[PDB]
């Protein structure tokens, strides 16, 4: 089990200048021929020539057209091809090989594989070695000349990187195409596609050089009508990079291709981006609302990779966050600008603080640049991606837009066409920092700790106001808990965007201010503060930290009502809920432990409920934001604040609090649900796929959130509304009608209705599966068995498997059933899935990530299942490594 260390990076003793590929696709096999034009590098010390090559069937190997002898001149163990140095030339030479591979039976979906009737590759991170021999690491830059041949009837459309320079017929109903891609690239950016693809296309003209760029979006013929939004998003992405960053696309053509079987969301292969169909295809009739922001972000993300990933590349995989964190940040700026809704930024924070904070306090905790790895496939984490994006976003907060764009331009200008490391980016920002501070001695050396230090910092506050002096003080402290990566944590450079609200009239008291906390603690003093303010802290969520604001609920309510910053309002509400949750949780826990016959619960704050009512009734307030304030914090956010969490007690706590608020506001909820209908469900542009209205979709989110609250509350006659809702043309609505009907006798009736609506669209059916899986049903285990026997069956499609099982794992009462039956079920699925797709098997482990945070019985139940999984003789390296780290073994 080899461990790779970041400090051990050394350049290869070899060079690969040119790759010439012939990929010959046949019915039962694919033959790959490869000529590598190679050289000896200056770092060479006479070593053996070792290629990566996984699962390759060798027909022959040669050096300079001389066939090599197995055993005497090379060995191959199905992972590494070793050519003994004595047979390696000392100057420029040609290495060639012909191997056989089998996309048809490649169910792991890495390397070359068959998705339905499409042949497609996935090479990031270590997939190219499953196609042919290579020194499979991102610093090996080469030119590519690729020929693909196949049966013309089955695979009429052939695609690879670069320019298609020849097309030709072949005897036997076959045909070929040759693509030449002269610019250097790492092998993980190579891609090929063959299939019966249909397309939409458009011509984009670049802003500055006026180059015409051909845009193609591809799917199977059945869903070609679902391609329109993707095309619009691509156009939007190119414009944004041009307008914000001044970056134009440099190639003559860009292809997007949707496939049904894909491990993640998408992949940025140069000129040939490949997508999970669920992140490229949509139509108003056959998609839930969520698909529209999803496609916008994933298309945007892959496009922005063209610079941050494809033109400036990684030296080694340890720099992953430099392309992933930076590209997520670029995608976030894009989406906020495109949606023009505050819920876009709130949704990313909601994700970070639930899922990534959980990871960062688990045994899997790591910095966004790890010091080591065993499995590259487990390196792609919410930490590297989403905390990475927050660290990338803090440069913009610190510098402001103008100097940030200057720093970013320095980075692209200085590293375009080269490999780079996280340090190169910090250096570029530092130059901006210098300029901004008008001080050549300013540096961002401390900033680098954001890359190396794991764990979530805690930032806490105390305040002082001297009325006679008009002087306000904010005392700030930062603390990161020691963990397995650092025994001693150092103070970070933490930018704290702040405002001061006058509690008397709700007005801003100071101009925009970012506090630069660089010590363990500091005191920030403000003069000429006319009245005691309420501090608006970490506006926009300006650092990825635990915020402990030490405000009263009265203060949080005033912020919630009157603050200008969406995140601080949302967070003040979040904090009011958390105080209530912790208090009620302990009251329920104590009653349970002491087996009390009677006890008291502390009611929800009445002025809080009044403030929620005030905001809901404000016709000028945002519907998206409203839906957040009537929702309790996520379970996986809550668990960060509770030791030995008893999931049953938390379920009871949430139920009490929702009932408390509903007892007061249900009439308001119903009234809004009714009044929102006309605007929310407007059908005016239902048949225009380029017309996407994010505010309107937020109005549906609010209606659907309210309907759920009303249904759980058993509001009088709400079943009437539920049944009418099931008749809506919008899938977000009629799938919502399915899950809220769970609390009624009509459920299986709507189950059958919505199934029939969903079954003839692959992606819609998967959304149906998710809805069923997430249904709040007492018979949920029997329902899941029904899904297995009747719908899922033996599908190896990762979208199907994830649809059936993952939403269910968020069922707090039922997945965590004290028998452990839920843990047993998911473990069976993980072990089953691991036989053909280790990557997705590891994704399916996600519910276990909080295992040591639960009550001691559930900890033991989960640990038992993970140890059972670890004991499987056939367990993959991928899953084994993950569970070993997760169980601290
Ligand atoms: C935030 C998502 C939209 C990003 C994608 C994957 P990616 O675009 O970062 C690509 N680089 C990749 C592909 C396959 C394996 C590893 C990495 C995702 O996770 O869905
Ligand atoms: Mg299918
Ligand atoms: Zn990416």
Author numbering: 196 to 1084
Q: Would you copy out the relevant sentences from the publication that reported this structure?
A:
The P. falciparum alanyl aminopeptidase, PfA-M1, and leucyl aminopeptidase, PfA-M17, act in concert to mediate the final stages of hemoglobin digestion. PfA-M1 coordinates a single zinc metal ion, while PfA-M17 contains two metal binding sites. The two aminopeptidases are each encoded by non-homologous genes and have been validated in vitro and in vivo as drug targets, as inhibition of their activity can control both murine and laboratory malaria parasites. The X-ray crystal structures of the potent compound 12 in complex with both PfA-M1 and PfA-M17 were solved to a resolution of 2.0 and 2.3 Å respectively.
